[PDB]
Design a protein around this nucleic acid. Structure first.
Ligand code: VO4
Length: 313
DNA sequence: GTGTCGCCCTT
DNA sequence: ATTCC
DNA sequence: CGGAATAAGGGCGACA
């Protein structure tokens, strides 16, 4: 669709606002259905009907820091939500490969990029930490996995504590005890003598992208997966543990709250942006609780994966 | 090859 | 993404 | 619970 330029209710083909579109351009219908936020500038509106806008990019504008902010139609958003079912199955199906890659590489020297990649994947599948692009470190002092420095790693004789300030200035602490798979290779990777150096000093964005590619997923998919995996573990444990069973509502709520606290974000975003939609609806089915009764977690996980498989298509 | 940018899209 | 409503 | 408002993340291919 053609990008039209918006000024004071009016649409133009050029960014200098010298060439107006016709009064019957279909994007004017779009403007009847959406509010252009007053805080955005340099607004671009796509030339399309409202029906076409439902599934597409509608408009873009610059916020006060000059960032381009994109607004999408409701069906685009719904189609986005629907993907999480598929992502959840896909990661489950590739986890054994990821663990095989970790185990193969985690015995190498700490200066070997393959070792570092192994430790990156292990930390990620254990803690679901965000990728950590350098750009937000520079722009906002934001730390994620790739931008961890030795300063963020605190070594005690019993434990290792990873603490850093991540997206939206939300502080995070993850603890790695002596008995953890991760403890030895993390202790090995960290350089106490160089607080300001990156932990993953032989990695880069490109090198991470190239390595994750072999598993058919992105790093953020490991986070989507971990949220669901964690919800399911908690759901199972809850059904199995709490003496008088809470109401349905109360149980889902408790499970989300627990899951969101492990992951480090709000219950609201956990459900809105991470939980697979089919998982959520199957957990409302009162016929489901009985299936849970006498499963192992893996049997339980395996039934959920199968139901999500046959319900995504 | 590297570090960054610019666009798109997501949380 | 958090916050607010 | 849900959703509006707006801030700031990730993914990917191209530029310097
Ligand atoms: O990154 V979203 O939690």
């Amino acid at each position: 669709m053609r990008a039209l330029f918006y000024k004071d209710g009016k649409l133009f083909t050029d960014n200098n606002f010298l060439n107006p579109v016709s009064d019957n351009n279909p994007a004017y219908e779009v403007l009847q259905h959406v509010k252009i936020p007053t805080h955005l500038t340099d607004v671009v509106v796509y030339g399309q009907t409202w029906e076409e806008a439902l599934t597409r990019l509608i408009f873009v504008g610059s916020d006060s820091k000059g960032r381009r902010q994109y607004f999408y139609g409701k069906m685009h958003v719904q189609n986005r939500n629907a993907k999480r079912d598929r992502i959840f199955v896909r990661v489950y199906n590739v986890m054994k490969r990821i663990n095989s890659f970790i185990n193969k590489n985690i015995k190498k020297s700490s200066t070997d990029s393959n070792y570092q990649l192994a430790v990156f994947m292990l930390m990620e599948t254990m803690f679901f930490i965000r990728f950590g692009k350098m750009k937000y470190l520079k722009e906002n002092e934001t730390v994620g996995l790739l931008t961890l420095k030795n300063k963020h790693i605190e070594i005690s004789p019993d434990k290792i504590v990873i603490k850093f300030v991540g997206k939206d200035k939300v502080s995070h602490e993850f603890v790695v005890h002596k008995s953890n798979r991760l403890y030895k290779p993390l202790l090995k990777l960290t350089d106490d003598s160089s607080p300001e150096e990156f932990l993953f000093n032989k990695l880069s964005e490109r090198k991470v992208y190239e390595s994750i590619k072999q598993f058919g997923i992105r790093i953020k998919d490991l986070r989507t997966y971990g949220v669901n995996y964690t919800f399911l573990y908690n759901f199972w444990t809850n059904v199995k543990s709490i003496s008088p069973l809470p109401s349905p509502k109360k149980l889902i709520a408790l499970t989300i709250k627990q899951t969101a606290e492990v992951v480090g974000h709000t219950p609201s975003i956990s459900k809105r942006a991470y939980m697979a939609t089919t998982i959520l609806e199957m957990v409302k089915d009162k016929n489901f609780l009985d299936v849970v009764s006498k499963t192992t977690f893996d049997e339980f996980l395996s039934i959920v994966v199968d139901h999500v498989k046959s319900s995504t298509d």
